[PDB]
Amino acid sequence: NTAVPCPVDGEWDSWGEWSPCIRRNMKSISCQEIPGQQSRGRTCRGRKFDGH
Amino acid sequence: GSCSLEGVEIKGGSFRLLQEGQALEYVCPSGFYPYPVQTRTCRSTGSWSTLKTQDQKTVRKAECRAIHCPRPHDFENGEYWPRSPYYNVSDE
Ligand SMILES: *[C@@H]1O[C@H](CO)[C@@H](O)[C@H](O)[C@H]1NC(C)=O
Ligand SMILES: *[C@H]1O[C@H](CO)[C@@H](O)[C@H](O)[C@@H]1O
Ligand SMILES: *[C@H]1O[C@H](CO)[C@@H](O)[C@H](O)[C@@H]1O
């Protein structure tokens, strides 16, 4: 019995929800021909004890 | 979003909204100029840009001040008269 816990590598979470599609200084771009940008987030969950 | 129009009015004048409310322009009467800032940009924090001078001094309230012609601070080989700290309109 060694009293040191082993490293565990973190695993990826699922992909989040897509952010609202806007453009800077372009009011609301809904139902128009104005291309915007949107984002999505993940979370590295589970890395403990100097894991990868 | 559009900036809030609170605390942005000027003492002795009005304003008009340009660039779809993303910039205000102060409208002082004839013979006055808006103190330092002529216009204000709408920064995306809810508040407008601060009343910064050319020396970057924070002015709290804005006011239409009188228009002065630039004073002669240098003149050689003669004498000009009268000397004044500032010159109002229609001075000779
Ligand atoms: C110009 O106008 C100001 C405004 O009050 C006044 O005080 C001053 O005496 C006037 N004349 C000159 C020469 O500055
Ligand atoms: C997000 O992207 C795809 C699903 O669209 C998969 O590779 C996985 O579920 C990931 O979390
Ligand atoms: C963003 O993209 C689509 C919606 O257009 C879906 O697969 C999901 O809601 C994702 O978050």
Q: What does the alpha-carbon distance between residue B84 and residue B92 come to, in Å, rounded to a whole number?
A: 11
- CB atoms under 10 Å from CB of A2, counted, come to 5
Q: What does the alpha-carbon distance between residue B18 and residue B74 come to, in Å, rounded to a whole number?
A: 40
Overall resolution, Å: 3.9
Please, which experimental method was used? X-ray
User: Probe ligand 3: pick from A17, A19, A21, A39, max atoms within 8 Å of CB?
Assistant: A17
Which ligand is in closest contact with the Cα of A40?
Answer: 3
> Which residue lies with its CA nearest to atom 1 of ligand 2?
A15
Q: Which two tokens stand for residue A27?
A: 């009011």
Question: Is there a contact between B52 and B36 (Cβ–Cβ < 8 Å)?
Answer: yes
